[PDB]
Amino acid sequence: AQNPNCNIMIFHPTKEEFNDFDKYIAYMESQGAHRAGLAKIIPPKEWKARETYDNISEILIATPLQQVASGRAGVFTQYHKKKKAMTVGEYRHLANSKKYQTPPHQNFEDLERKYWKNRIYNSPIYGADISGSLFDENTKQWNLGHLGTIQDLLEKECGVVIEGVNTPYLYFGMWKTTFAWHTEDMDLYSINYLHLGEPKTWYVVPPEHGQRLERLARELFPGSSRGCGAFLRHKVALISPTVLKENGIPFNRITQEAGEFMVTFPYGYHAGFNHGFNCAEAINFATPRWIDYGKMASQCSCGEARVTFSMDAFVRILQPERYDLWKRGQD
Numbered sequence: 423a424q425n426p427n428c429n430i431m432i433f434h435p436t437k438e439e440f441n442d443f444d445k446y447i448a449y450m451e452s453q454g455a456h457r458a459g460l461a462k463i464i465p466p467k468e469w470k471a472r473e474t475y476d477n478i479s480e481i482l483i484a485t486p487l488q489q490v491a492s493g494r495a496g497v498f499t500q501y502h503k504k505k506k507a508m509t510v511g512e513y514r515h516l517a518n519s520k521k522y523q524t525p526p527h528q529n530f531e532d533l534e535r536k537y538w539k540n541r542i543y544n545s546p547i548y549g550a551d552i553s554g555s556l557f558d559e560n561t562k563q564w565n566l567g568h569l570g571t572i573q574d575l576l577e578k579e580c581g582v583v584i585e586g587v588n589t590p591y592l593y594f595g596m597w598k599t600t601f602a603w604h605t606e607d608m609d610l611y612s613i614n615y616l617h618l619g620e621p622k623t624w625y626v627v628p629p630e631h632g633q634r635l636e637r638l639a640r641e642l643f644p645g646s647s648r649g650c651g652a653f654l655r656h657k658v659a660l661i662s663p664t665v666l667k668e669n670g671i672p673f674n675r676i677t678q679e680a681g682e683f684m685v686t687f688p689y690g691y692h693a694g695f696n697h698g699f700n701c702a703e704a705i706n707f708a709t710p711r712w713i714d715y716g717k718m719a720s721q722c723s724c725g726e727a728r729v730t731f732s733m734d735a736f737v738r739i740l741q742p743e744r745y746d747l748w749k750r751g752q753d
């Protein structure tokens with residue numbers, strides 16, 4: 423078995439190898455990449471997502487989210503308080519302010535220490551989940567707005583034609599902005615490209631060990647666990663590496679820099695934080711190997727996780743017994 427220790431793998435495709443996205447994902451899996459839950463892909467040196475970022479300041483962040491934490495430094499939840507709209511230019515200025523900017527630090531490790539020590543005491547503002555793309559339409563390779571759609575994968579594999587569309591999302595981050603422990607909707611893959619700015623640190627649990635993280639999470643967030651059988655779908659809980667190590671949970675960490683792609687694999691729990699002002703683009707995707715994970719994916723039926731139009735059809739076709747109760751949560 424390849425990659426038996428479930429290490430995060432880093433790939434350096436040539437421009438030739440960068441032409442066929444599906445084929446490259448299947449190659450990475452042939453090398454065991456999916457066992458980690460997360461892989462890094464460094465694009466060929468000739469490739470660019472677009473010519474410049476010089477004219478992005480007029481993008482609107484219609485609902486910036488202030489991420490308020492509760493709990494202790496290593497075990498906390500975050501709630502998102504909606505803020506008034508602002509442009510990316512306004513947000514970047516805010517991120518660079520004395521109140522919100524990245525502190526002095528020695529290296530990524532010192533910064534990671536400072537994030538875990540101090541996150542809970544601040545409420546950074548995240549411009550998350552903005553429909554749109556920053557790929558130039560002329561970028562033909564690994565353009566996250568031109569991928570094959572999940573509906574078309576399901577149709578090719580299973581023969582069933584369903585409604586729904588699949589489009590990317592922009593994320594504008596600042597120091598301490600945080601993504602909580604989660605897998606993707608329907609345990610899909612994700613791909614994330616860091617367009618610009620400061621890095622993003624990721625933590626990931628191998629898919630084969632995901633249930634170990636869930637059992638820890640039920641112990642650490644016991645009222646949340648009683649409220650919902652899949653409360654990590656709410657995307658609110660954080661657990662530090664120190665706490666994961668204390669409790670024997672297998673995980674790995676890696677820092678993504680501007681110009682790099684990350685792939686998360688089905689049922690690969692991930693969490694992380696931004697080092698400073700940045701912009702990422704991400705989208706879900708599927709492969710034939712995903713179908714079985716989609717059939718087995720947990721679902722929030724408490725009503726908190728409240729997800730897309732397109733997830734309806736996935737539930738309806740892959741999880742018909744759940745269908746009924748899950749849509750009671752979503753209506």
Ligand SMILES: O=C(O)CNC(=O)C(=O)O
Pocket residue numbers: 550593600601612613614686692702704705
């Ligand atoms: O970048 C972030 O805030 C969150 N991204 C992801 O969880 C992803 O790409 O799957």
Ligand SMILES: [Mg+2]
Pocket residue numbers: 477478479480481
């Ligand atoms: Mg603009």
Ligand code: NI
Pocket residue numbers: 604605606612686692
């Ligand atoms: Ni994700």
Ligand SMILES: [Zn+2]
Pocket residue numbers: 649650651652653655656722723724725726727
């Ligand atoms: Zn729920």
